[PDB]
Design a protein around this ligand. Sequence first.
Ligand SMILES: NC(=O)c1ccc[n+]([C@@H]2O[C@H](COP(=O)([O-])OP(=O)(O)OC[C@H]3O[C@@H](n4cnc5c(N)ncnc54)[C@H](O)[C@@H]3O)[C@@H](O)[C@H]2O)c1
Ligand SMILES: NC(=O)c1ccc[n+]([C@@H]2O[C@H](COP(=O)([O-])OP(=O)(O)OC[C@H]3O[C@@H](n4cnc5c(N)ncnc54)[C@H](O)[C@@H]3O)[C@@H](O)[C@H]2O)c1
Ligand SMILES: [Cl-]
Lengths: 304, 321
Amino acid sequence: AMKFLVTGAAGFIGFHIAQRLLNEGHNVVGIDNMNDYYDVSLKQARLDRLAYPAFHFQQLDLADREGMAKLFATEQFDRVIHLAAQAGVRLENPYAYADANLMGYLNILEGCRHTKVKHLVYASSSSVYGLNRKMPFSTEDSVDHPVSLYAATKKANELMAHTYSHLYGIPTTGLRFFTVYGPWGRPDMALFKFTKAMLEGRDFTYIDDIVEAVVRVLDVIPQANADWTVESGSPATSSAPYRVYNIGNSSPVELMDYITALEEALGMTSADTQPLYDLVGFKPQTSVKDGVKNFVDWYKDYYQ
Amino acid sequence: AMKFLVTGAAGFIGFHIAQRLLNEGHNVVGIDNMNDYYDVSLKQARLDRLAYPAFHFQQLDLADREGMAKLFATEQFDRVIHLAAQANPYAYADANLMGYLNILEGCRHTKVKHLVYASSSSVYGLNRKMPFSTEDSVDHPVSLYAATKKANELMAHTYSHLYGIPTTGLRFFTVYGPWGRPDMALFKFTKAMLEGKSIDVYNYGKMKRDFTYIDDIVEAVVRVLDVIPQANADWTVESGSPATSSAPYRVYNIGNSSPVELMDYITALEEALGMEAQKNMMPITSADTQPLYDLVGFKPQTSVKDGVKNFVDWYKDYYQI
Ligand SMILES: NC(=O)c1ccc[n+]([C@@H]2O[C@H](COP(=O)([O-])OP(=O)(O)OC[C@H]3O[C@@H](n4cnc5c(N)ncnc54)[C@H](O)[C@@H]3O)[C@@H](O)[C@H]2O)c1
Ligand SMILES: NC(=O)c1ccc[n+]([C@@H]2O[C@H](COP(=O)([O-])OP(=O)(O)OC[C@H]3O[C@@H](n4cnc5c(N)ncnc54)[C@H](O)[C@@H]3O)[C@@H](O)[C@H]2O)c1
Ligand SMILES: [Cl-]
């Protein structure tokens, strides 16, 4: 079987990707540092649901140079899906972003270089669009004006990916994420905060739709293009085997619809995502009603 | 008096910037980790020539978070000229990514009034349209060094935007002159010549390298340090460039438009050293500096003829040739 590394495997998206890859018969190695940015017991709960014979978990920090080098050298991964990062756009704790998103990403790249990983798929962010105002945001647009350190680190990942694709031939695909929600979600994002505070005192994609797109992209390996030039190409293409795509749900939905969906279930800025829907022949088809219902059902089940 | 931090102060460019600032009457703190990428005795020799009462040196690594914080906290700098960098992939990350964040944090928390920092022409990457302009996209780097320099520009943009720290990045091409670095420019050729090593020569020696004499770089940088970028509510991405912003953020090319080709430098060195260089012929570019001309009202004045003579005068004396 193929051997995949899923980083951030105890996290929201990593858990779902690892779970899907395991259900498809692959060998999966998961790593996560189980940091306390949010409830570590939630991460542990996710990690407990990945107990499969073909799943191996290693608590490892991305910034651990020797540890990371050893992991790559020993496992000889076929592909890597890199999701571990310090997320959240919203100034306090800059060193966490440098550690995880800059140094940590270079260690991923070094691992891929030394062991000739066949495809590295990694998480970028819509925040790279920064001060841009021309809508819908497109990967053909310049992304030079980030307004958060988090965004700057994600663009730096794309630049580093380009460098490694060009020098070493490692195929890379960066995915610019918008807002993801669903069961086993993040405590620090809106949908969860609301549900919790509500019980006490935008571009949204349901997690299953994200998983489906990422697993298809993992199988589409970028190839070199000797005819590509900067002057007639894009910041998301290259002569190197390098690609960047927006991932999301191009649907007109303001924040109030989801707020209304919560109250219904509890009883009390645009983006061009067409290049990805084409490449993999899939488009998100989960309705806000079903999505929030799945979240609340999970929320109530898990927390009560 | 004003107090400046010069990082990389025992290095080539940093030494010259610190020396000039001291000669203008300013207070300067120089830092360097004295690494052995090239001869540490040369770095110490530069540091010896910065012995002035208004100069203080601290051996400090850019990646030492607590050490960097202590430096900024105790000194309360008015301005910073950041030149220290690796130019081992982990060295680039340490010095050029984490180290740059320590600089930005220091500037943020102590309200430094202007941060000038070294970028590089390598950010132009796969670009082919000449001349290279700061209006051009710089999304396709071909080296980790280049990617880290573009990352510095991105990080500078975010700090200028969020905290109002004025930042000016300078995309250097090639610099040469007295107290230069042994691995580059005229020093590289001179060393090769005196050791009987062959110099690789591309495109019949007609490659137009962008070489600027150190004194011309120093004059420009010291003028730039005094031009503080301002916020601009009229700027938009759609009508702007990767080197401008609504934030007090600017990036400029710094270099020499002279049409002198590589062979002009080699021939001049041969004459100055009184010998002929061994050459290996390899079987079978320009930059726009108008924005810095409109900004500081100064262009490079040193000819190749004089620059080469200046270099050789330094080299012979320092190495007791
Ligand atoms: N969920 C979203 O809406 C969203 C939006 C934009 C971008 N992203 C990106 O997608 C990826 C996954 O996000 P998520 O929502 O699952 O976040 P998450 O925080 O739930 O998952 C990330 C996991 O990475 C791990 N991690 C962080 N730093 C680490 C380090 N230094 N070493 C090892 N492990 C480390 C964390 O412990 C966590 O479990 C991230 O790169 C994030 O930037 C997500
Ligand atoms: N010389 C050129 O032609 C040229 C061209 C393009 C860019 N630059 C840039 O200009 C800057 C100055 O370069 P230079 O040519 O004077 O090089 P240099 O190597 O002579 O000087 C740099 C100094 O930085 C110090 N340093 C490196 N890493 C450090 C760390 N982690 N902590 C503390 N000190 C550290 C070194 O010890 C060195 O003395 C660099 O940022 C470089 O990328 C120079
Ligand atoms: Cl030189």
